[PDB]
């Protein structure tokens with residue numbers, strides 16, 4: 615059923631996945647959110663939103679566990695690389711799984727991808743003196759894609775056509791790979807970057823670009839999800855009155871953090887925000903207040919140590935207050951069960 619507690623535990627699974635993939639899959643399975651078969655997890659990982667592409671790659675990229683190996687085989691076996699050049703296939707593979715990072719992870723992803731490519735194109739492998747060259751060429755394409763489209767590497771230090779060629783010299787069991795073969799790859803990658811589909815993290819990146827000042831704090835971690843944006847007015851003193859537009863603050867509520875900001879510069883569909891403060895949802899309580907001067911007040915509190923008053927707002931209207939305080943209150947619950955589950959360290963200390 616579309617139960618609040620039920621839904622809330624789905625999302626708790628996803629958050630565990632986006633921090634500790636092995637733990638998150640266990641969690642989703644132990645509750646019947648995804649089947650305990652490699653095929654079932656495969657389709658989950660590549661079909662369900664709420665899953666970070668970086669950790670789908672960290673999960674599949676694990677070579678030790680046999681289950682993880684088995685799911686990667688189901689993933690590649692559901693991709694069709696026939697009649698494709700090796701880069702055109704990588705474009706399709708890198709579309710679902712981020713291939714980048716710890717070399718042991720990129721090895722196991724590329725290994726699984728190349729094997730699938732060989733099966734879909736036996737005529738291409740016959741053109742090679744050694745079939746393993748397909749792995750080396752694949753890895754090369756990843757690396758070229760990273761460098762050609764890296765902002766830290768300025769054009770002048772970027773890998774040019776003959777740099778690429780020169781690096782793949784004499785690797786096909788002593789012989790070069792055909793120059794016209796490598797040149798097609800380079801032009802195709804040059805014509806459009808191998809991009810991975812956007813996930814919740816790429817929404818958090820957009821936001822974090824628009825907010826100057828931060829205390830860190832990165833903000834775009836894998837587990838963190840944008841939940842809600844809201845315009846409320848900070849109330850320094852809820853016992854004194856204040857002018858209806860004073861202290862206007864734009865509030866970004868993420869699934870485990872509330873960020874308070876003020877508009878820095880407004881313009882035609884282009885706004886920046888100055889970061890003011892952020893609060894952790896662990897131990898937060900959300901109170902409503904109505905008095906002589908504020909009819910839609912919100913007071914936020916930190917019960918964890920005596921009770922602390924974090925911040926007071928007043929929303930524009932009572933509908934906004936009810937949407938905001940409900941979203942924040944469910945996030946606070948979501949975070950409470952995350953730590954209530956995280957005090958599992960009793961089974962980790964023997």
Ligand SMILES: Cc1ccc2c(c1[N+](=O)[O-])C(=O)C[C@@H](C(F)(F)F)O2
Nearest residue numbers: 848850859860861862863876877890
């Ligand atoms: C420095 C600075 C800049 C803008 C601000 C504030 C502050 N500050 O003094 O912290 C506020 O406190 C509230 C608010 C308002 F403009 F409405 F008064 O916007």
